[PDB]
Amino acid sequence: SPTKAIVRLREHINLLSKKQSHLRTQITNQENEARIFLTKGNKVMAKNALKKKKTIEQLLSKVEGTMESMEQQLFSIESANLNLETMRAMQEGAKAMKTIHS
Numbered sequence: 001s002p003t004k005a006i007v008r009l010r011e012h013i014n015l016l017s018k019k020q021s022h023l024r025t026q027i028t029n030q031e032n033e034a035r036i037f038l039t040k041g042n043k044v045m046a047k048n049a050l051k052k053k054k055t056i057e058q059l060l061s062k063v064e065g066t067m068e069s070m071e072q073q074l075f076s077i078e079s080a081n082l083n084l085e086t087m088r089a090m091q092e093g094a095k096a097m098k099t100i101h102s
Contacts, residue, residue: 002077009074016067023060
């Protein structure tokens with residue numbers, strides 16, 4: 001069923017949002033790692049921590065983009081069902097008109 005499809009897509013999105021929080025946390029930690037090296041005076045390792053920061057940012061973008069795709073499919077399914085309900089509403093309106101003419 002399309003309802004189940006929506007639940008399953010949301011299920012994966014929820015798991016991806018856990019990855020989102022995890023990777024976002026790592027990005028903050030990599031920034032902090034770099035700041036620690038800057039206070040130590042080791043700019044080489046600070047830049048390397050920023051390289052790791054950017055690496056995780058790329059992974060976060062992948063997770064966020066994956067959720068976007070699932071949401072597009074999810075909302076497309078929802079919209080399809082809303083269009084079927086709009087259709088049924090118009091069909092009942094037509095029935096009312098049939099009664100008026102009859």
